[PDB]
Amino acid sequence: LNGLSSDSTIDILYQLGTTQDPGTKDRIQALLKWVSDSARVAAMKRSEYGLLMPSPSHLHCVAAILWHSYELLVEYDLPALLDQELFELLFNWSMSLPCNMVLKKAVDSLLCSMCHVHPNYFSLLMGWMGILALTESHLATLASSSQSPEAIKQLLDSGLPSLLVRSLASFCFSKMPITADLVAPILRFLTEVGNSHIMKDWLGGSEVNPLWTALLFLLCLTTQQRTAIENATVAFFLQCISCHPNNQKLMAQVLCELFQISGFIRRLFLQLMLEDEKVTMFLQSPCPLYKGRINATSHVIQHPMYGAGHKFRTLHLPVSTTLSDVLDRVSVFHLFHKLLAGQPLPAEMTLAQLLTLLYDRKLPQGYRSIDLTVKLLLETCPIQSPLQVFAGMGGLALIAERLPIPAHSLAAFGLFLRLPGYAEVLLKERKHAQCLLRLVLGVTDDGEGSHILQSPSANVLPTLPFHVLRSLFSTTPLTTDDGVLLRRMALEIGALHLILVCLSALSHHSPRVDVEQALTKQRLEEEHVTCLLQVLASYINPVALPSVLLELLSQSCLIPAMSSYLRNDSVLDMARHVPLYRALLELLRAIASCAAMVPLLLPLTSVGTLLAKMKTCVDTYTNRLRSKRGLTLLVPDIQKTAEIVYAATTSLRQAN
């Protein structure tokens, strides 16, 4: 069967086309003759098997040959071979093919390479399209063929993207007629051309940014039309904000204005913000990259600049992917970037750190792909995710106001998200934060088919909301005004109430005013009580306070709880719950450092006396150990902390 393609034949054709020897010009002419003969046979059939059924992979390989030989500065007249007659033949061929067909994509890659060699061919193409009644085929061909800096500049200067954006905005808020059927094709066209960073900058510019709000207003029509427009809008926004900080700021601003959480806006938020950003990596090697290739025929029609054959690979990877993972996907191998000239990239960098470095080295923001070379900085901050941009503008607090894992943990997380700075502390663990955020939006999957509960470190999720709060309170002192506002808002929104209500249900005490299945439950509850005690300690004594605090902490189950934990005469029994007792001591040191709270330690059988008894227990235990001659860190904790609490109560009673 003639004309059948495979990775091997594609590589053969690419080597023949791009091998620069005195016959290369004739080989290129032969490839273009095959292309022209295939196009003409297609035209006849519209009105020899290698012509009747040209491999899309082979047409794309010819396109990649043309692209790379144009960029390789060949010693023959490459532009002379690419005549306007061939361009017109290919334009008619592609215009005849239905959209989304792989053959049409290959012919359009050929058109893209020809426009890249002769930019005036893009003007001819636009004229032939009428650049109005642009069909989906017109848009597909134009988007594919405009993927060159010259063609993209001409497309922008034609006013066609502006016309499309204005017409789409006029449609959303209700010069070129737009119907609901044309909205999704136009959005797909804008996404395709927005593969380019120039169009990506234009789409996040002042002329287009009304369209973002217009789309959200329209989505926040037939049911199928609404679904198509919603998917197209999500794809469009993802392309616009993909590794593009300025468009991320714009998207965050638009979302915040929208909020100032169900249906499309939830779906959008889940797809745009609660999923890892994906970036395109373009790997070039001086030697073939075979790992990951299947011997069966595959028509991978990408942009011709990404080459063809074994020495070029294109991977759409999450930005969390390490460079070692990329190399293992394609294959001592060293990854290099042109901007970081002559510096092997460390294998554990991650693509986010690489993007940070490259944007620092003047890589255009939103650039379509990371272009690495496989030949043969780890402190770098990862590039901000769109969620970090949204959170940094208070967007998550806005979402919080519109919002197995314990239910109280989720409710606490939803409430704590309204606190100032909470989202910024939360997002220091991007994947953990993503899991919680997806959970509070009513989504159990992580976006990749994996249940969050069955995800890595799903055992830290239940108390993660409270650990974030402890870090928030602990790094925010009382002296600073943000700390007062934080402490005041926490009480006002009910964060302190929830913590004390959770303390009641988890310590099993009440406000003062199978066998292993139960054991693991008891251990889980004590880990929650531990963090809740620590959260309270950091709220009172970070490493001023609302006046209704002492009343609230006195009517609360807190005094019951700490007294019962302090009513333990078995130092070895304290060795089994060290995290709880260290947290208990820290919460007592917090109360002992706040003269307004010390009243909580003196008699209402006081906690201060109970702590005093616990001290005598441990000093006697030490004496017995001395006589015989995690208690290690806990044996001084009660000792030192008893002195703090004892001293604090003595000073108060002297004051009285």
UniProtKB/Swiss-Prot annotation:
Location within or outside the cell: Golgi apparatus, trans-Golgi network membrane; Endosome; Cytoplasm, Cytoskeleton, Spindle pole; Cytoplasm, Cytoskeleton, Microtubule organizing center, Centrosome
Family: Belongs to the BIRC6 family.
Protein name, as recorded: Dual E2 ubiquitin-conjugating enzyme/E3 ubiquitin-protein ligase BIRC6
The organism's taxonomic lineage, starting at the top: Eukaryota, Metazoa, Chordata, Craniata, Vertebrata
Tissue spec. comment: Expressed in brain cancer cells.
Provenance organism: Homo sapiens (Human)
Function comment: Anti-apoptotic protein known as inhibitor of apoptosis (IAP) which can regulate cell death by controlling caspases and by acting as an E3 ubiquitin-protein ligase. Unlike most IAPs, does not contain a RING domain and it is not a RING-type E3 ligase. Instead acts as a dual E2/E3 enzyme that combines ubiquitin conjugating (E2) and ubiquitin ligase (E3) activities in a single polypeptide. Ubiquitination is mediated by a non-canonical E1 ubiquitin activating enzyme UBA6.
Domain description: The BIR domain is essential for its anti-apoptotic function and is important for binding to DIABLO/SMAC and caspases.
Oligomeric and partner information: Homodimer; antiparallel. Interacts with RNF41. Interacts with DIABLO/SMAC, likely with higher affinity to SMAC dimer than SMAC monomer; this interaction blocks the substrate-binding site and inhibits the caspase inhibition activity of BIRC6. Interacts with KIF23/MKLP1, USP8/UBPY, BIRC5/survivin, MAP2K1/MEK1, RAB8A/RAB8, RAB11A/RAB11, PLK1, EXOC3/SEC6 and EXOC4/SEC8.
Lineage: superkingdom: Eukaryota
Post-translational modification: Ubiquitinated; mediated by RNF41 E3 ligase and leads to proteasomal degradation, impairing inhibition of apoptosis. Deubiquitinated by USP8/UBPY. Autoubiquitinated; mediated by E1 ubiquitin activating enzyme UBA6. Proteolytically cleaved. Acts as substrate for CASP3, CASP6, CASP7, CASP9 and HTRA2.
